Write a protein that binds this ligand. Sequence first.
Ligand SMILES: [Mg+2]
Ligand SMILES: [Zn+2]
Lengths: 139, 148, 90, 1110, 50, 52
Amino acid sequence: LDVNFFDELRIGLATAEDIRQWSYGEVKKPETINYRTLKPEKDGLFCEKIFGPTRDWECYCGKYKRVRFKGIICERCGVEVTRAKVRRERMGHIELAAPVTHIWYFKGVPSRLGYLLDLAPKDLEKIIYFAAYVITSVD
Amino acid sequence: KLRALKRLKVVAAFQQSGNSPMGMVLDAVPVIPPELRPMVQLDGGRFATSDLNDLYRRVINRNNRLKRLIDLGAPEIIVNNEKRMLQESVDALFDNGRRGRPVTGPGNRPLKSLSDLLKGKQGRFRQNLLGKRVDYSGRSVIVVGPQL
Amino acid sequence: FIEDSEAVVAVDAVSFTLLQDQLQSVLDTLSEREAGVVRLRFGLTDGQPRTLDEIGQVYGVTRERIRQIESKTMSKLRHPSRSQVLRDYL
Amino acid sequence: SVPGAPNRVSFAKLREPLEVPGLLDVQTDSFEWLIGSPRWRESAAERGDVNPVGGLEEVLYELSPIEDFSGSMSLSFSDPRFDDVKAPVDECKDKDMTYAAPLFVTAEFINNNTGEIKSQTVFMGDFPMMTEKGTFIINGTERVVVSQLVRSPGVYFDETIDKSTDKTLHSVKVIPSRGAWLEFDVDKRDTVGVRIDRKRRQPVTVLLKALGWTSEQIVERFGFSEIMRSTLEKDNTVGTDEALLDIYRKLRPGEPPTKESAQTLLENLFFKEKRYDLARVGRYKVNKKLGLHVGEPITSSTLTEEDVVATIEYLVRLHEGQTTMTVPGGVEVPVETDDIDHFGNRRLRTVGELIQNQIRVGMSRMERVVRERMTTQDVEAITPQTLINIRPVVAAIKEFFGTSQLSQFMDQNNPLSGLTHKRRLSALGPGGLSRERAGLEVRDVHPSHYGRMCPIETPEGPNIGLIGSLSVYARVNPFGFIETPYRKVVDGVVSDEIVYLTADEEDRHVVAQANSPIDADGRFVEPRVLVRRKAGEVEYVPSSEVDYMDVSPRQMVSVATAMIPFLEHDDANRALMGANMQRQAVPLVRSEAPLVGTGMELRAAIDAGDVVVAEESGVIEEVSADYITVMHDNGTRRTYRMRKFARSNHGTCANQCPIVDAGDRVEAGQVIADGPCTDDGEMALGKNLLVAIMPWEGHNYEDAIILSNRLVEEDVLTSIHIEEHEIDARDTKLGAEEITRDIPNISDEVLADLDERGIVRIGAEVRDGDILVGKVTPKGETELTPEERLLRAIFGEKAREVRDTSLKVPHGESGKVIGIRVFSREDEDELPAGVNELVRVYVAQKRKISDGDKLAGRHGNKGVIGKILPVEDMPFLADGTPVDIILNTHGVPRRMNIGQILETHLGWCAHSGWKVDAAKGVPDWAARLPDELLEAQPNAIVSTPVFDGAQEAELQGLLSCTLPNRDGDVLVDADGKAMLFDGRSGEPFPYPVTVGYMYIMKLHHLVDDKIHARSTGPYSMITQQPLGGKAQFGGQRFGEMECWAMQAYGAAYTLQELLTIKSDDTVGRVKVYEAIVKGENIPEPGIPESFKVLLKELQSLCLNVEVLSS
Amino acid sequence: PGSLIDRAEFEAENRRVVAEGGEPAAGRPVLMGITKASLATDSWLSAASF
Amino acid sequence: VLRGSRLGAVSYETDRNHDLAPRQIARYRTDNGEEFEVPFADDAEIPGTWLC
DNA sequence: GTATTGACTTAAAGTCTAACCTATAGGATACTTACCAGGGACACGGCG
RNA sequence: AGCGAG
Ligand SMILES: [Mg+2]
Ligand SMILES: [Zn+2]
């Protein structure tokens, strides 16, 4: 907004809840654009329905247009009709079918995951990359 | 005591703050806005990817394939291999070449990952934030003027 | 090495701003009803263009009167007097 | 020597035994070897006719025969043969098609069981060919393959000292071609140890027992040293199978150890050619170093256990401190450490070697696809034509000649630049040192470089030492090493027999120096003759019994450095800069041969290839400004066609004009039409200018130059620059682009010159912004704003639905329009896919010298032009002749390039002419002057060869006798200084001034290409901060150092302004433009866009970054 | 223990701790380097960009 | 310059916050008890299922 | 000049029908494990 | 990749 209301800049871990709170959708298909019409594809990496329209103030089909329909979503394609520059601002999120570990907290020596769990870096690398089992509970 | 002390520089951090130690393990991977990884129709129609859509495509392909393999019902060998591949894909997305050979693209060159954008003299912190190109500027050869 | 070909070029932007300003002024020169008809014909006032019938309805006059006054407005604005203040923008 | 040449008299006191070689041989001879031409066949047969095999023949022979896993059938290649080139050289250069020739190889398929042979030519592909000028033509462009300097494969022994013990520990590194390194290192502990493929060390006895040695045998061979006995004792490995098991467990862990994969493991790793090819040079080096198979020819580059055993024995003997070893059945060799930078270990991969290696990679790929398909090949249904896929080979060749770093864009600023781009040895590239990984010991000069590589000519940027230039007389050994000629001096008697020695052979011989006086009987006229020895140390000398002598002076300098007169009076830095700056001189319109030059001018021009030379003797039948027809001595006649006003790669002019009349008889090899920078056949890079060496009013301050206006009036420093603009109408979604004079919305004034068909007419002057090619691409339906629709109705127009993408003279350019080259699909001309037309317009401008342009002499005395004075306020000699240039005296003494002053003096003498007064004999200072130099007519060209030239005493003498200009008046006293009159004040300067004639060149750093400015323009894609570069409309980088300087000044507001609204903030940018244009205050700056880009990048790294308000 | 803490903050914590029960945390001066002293700053945005 | 484009386009149209089309926020509920508002325009049937 | 009606033609839909893309399935001899730097600092495994 | 200034 304004560089006077910029008192602090905090950095911290982003939990899965934060990641899916930033997101305006979920990229579910590994597609970018149409080969022939060269337009953003549905649910793809460049999806217009998630990150906004490629052209200022239009839905994907063309039903709603112009500033007069600002803040609306076409019911056919689902694109919100607003400025295209929001495509530089809105994020998505992929819902992993299985959990993964952030590499920065595993490989970066000292292995912070290892120090937290007291697992040797070799052991952590074996567990995480499915080379050796590990016991998580014992009655 | 030395190993104990080093471990208390990471075990204290997750205590002093109300941060969970869970943020290390991901269930969702954020996807950067598309125009920060543009796909541009260069002159001649030849499209130019962003080198990050490839890593994201790999992640999404492997995630969807994992979903389908779990849905069908597959032996633990194949599903565990798929999970390892998904872990490697997310690793390559966040940092190429940190573990194993870097993921290479066409021409046998490493794929510019999501962390290479920040590190180095050609990274973002040093090539586009502290130093920038400016308008209203020119350059020319200098010649002595003693009458000035 | 690739130029964003869809960035505010910062010269056409000021050109458009001054174009709107001078167009508004030259419109204010002509009679008020004339200004209104041309405005609501091209949707300058709020970005919504309409045809003869709508303007006839809103002013409670048959379509044909709006058409006629529109023709007179175009003829007036085309006069060399109010064209040199609007050329170099097309 | 050359039939028709300018008579340049020389101050040379030494006769040259060897004529300068075929300076371009480095490229053409290597390529002829690769092809296997009859010329190379004869040259090799003269010197080793045992096994003349070309590069392609070698590749085919190594590849063939091939068989499948079962060996039921095999394929072979033979008889490579080239067809005639597809198109002539000029046409290939014109229409953008590669200058290549078809390659045919006879295949042969033998079904080993059934017993059928099937042979047929296979058309391996369009092999690019080398033009007679030693250069390739690829995609119309002119390219040069620069030789590469690489570490020669072989065995290298090193010794170091360990801090923790302070003991001399040695090491060896058998370095193969595409093998696995075996470094038999010796540690501080007294135990030798192997390190196979860089894997966790081993005791050597383990490998020996892996080779099947018994401990009794091991002590029988490596028994003399205590280190070996210690290793056997502490090894603990008992048994051959134990050693093999341990070796396999260490080399390839994770797989179940066996006996089969323990033995064949090592056998395949080292002693099978599949994976450990040493190459011919590598095996020859190993044999010579260890003295194993000196007599026998070379074949089967793969190793033998004997080689490894001998390497271990040599390392151990070296550690003990022995001097020589005699391997059983091998000649004894001296035990000593190797130097990696010695030119007995740095070999040249010439153009032939690089192209052959790429052919080899492509053939390996083709071989692999052949083998893979052979399984799925129906027996008896297959022929070599349908079994061979040439695509990998042609793909490898094409990807080499383009985008390979050793296939460089030909550097043609002038003939010298092209000639020196050839004969260039770069120590970096594929399989070579990289600038970052290259240490500081490879960049230095080694004693072995003398005569094989120039110590002076070298880039001065971050490439010093990695790129050098081959010396004048240097030659390349068939094995890739660089040889240099020497005169065999026998029994103290110098001879003429010129032996070409490589660095190794030179070290073993006590080689003398070129300028050693000879008594005219072939014998040295003095004891104490200067000499060099093996260690590179120049020191005192054993009189008599010196085995070799330098062929001539200047043997150590390259072609570019051989054209600097008075080189010996210049420091290495200034000589280096002069050499690197001769190659930047632009071709002037006229070109004048220097008054003071060398013997290399004529040969350099001839061998550069940009000067036309008659092929055979004959009488010029008809000469015109575009061609020369010559009638040969026997009936036939030949027409040489000049290349008029052609554009070089770097934008300069390539004009050729004849220098022969319509009746002259011309002999074979005679120059008949000078090139761009040539005058009467000899190279001419600049102009001779009357120079004063005084300081003048602070305008020639700090290496700045002030030139008379005569140089702009008479047009002596002026260069034609031709610039090509390309535009291609393509096929787009909305339709196709048209090239016509119907550009939308643009008036009938800026559509004036454009022809009936679009593209501008020839000879039409165009200034920056004018239209060259009128192109119109479709727009597709869009949304005209209400304001613009109203305006169109008021002014009665239509959208036209087609945008303009016309080609325009880019900003800051101008000039006429030489010619238009139009390629079109409709006329069936090869064009890329999806383009209908491609038009190129050539725009020529005659640049005149102006302040900001860079000038230089040949002695590193560079400088930009600060001012161009009128001729009237120019110092003029007492005669009235104004001086043309004024250099500063403050730059001579400290830069240590006094040679320029010498040149100046000599130049003046050459300009005036002289007569030594030999009334009573010859003056003592002129006794050793060559005859006929005692008298020179005015304006007499002279030469001072590099390291034998005009001694200072001879120059003093010639300066004393300087026969008068027109009346009896010597304008330059014996001191060389003239009394000058002030142009402005009018009074004479109180003291004489050093005046003469300096030959100065106009470097290609013209201010017209350097000026740039910007107020607003394109902005980069992902970030703002506008594009950089004069080519775009580029903003000047404001880096971190500049920002620190601003912070130190305390100027916070200017820094914020710069980094926010001038660069990145996309909302405050148009706002500041509005404020400036409307007279309002510049607005408050916002958040730079790059910071939000950073925030999104951090968040996408799963880092929750949030900007807390407070 | 082994933590490198700024002297000003060290004194501030000592002042905060003398009251409400005094447990003086003894410390010893250290000479860092320019790189270590820079990367130990309290601002991650400058250390990261360094 | 290579002069690329992101496709799409720009549209300078004076931003208005005063006279705006009427909207009817429609609430949807996913399986995991998560509500989600969606500002659809009144002149269109509110769909019965939304990919939230 | 400004108030109208009665025709008189026209582009934009709005829609039905046809072809040309698109998501998807299948294919039965037998084939079963791929492919040259240094210089400093910190951390992990062996050995004493 | 070559190249310029320090
Ligand atoms: Mg300088
Ligand atoms: Zn829509």
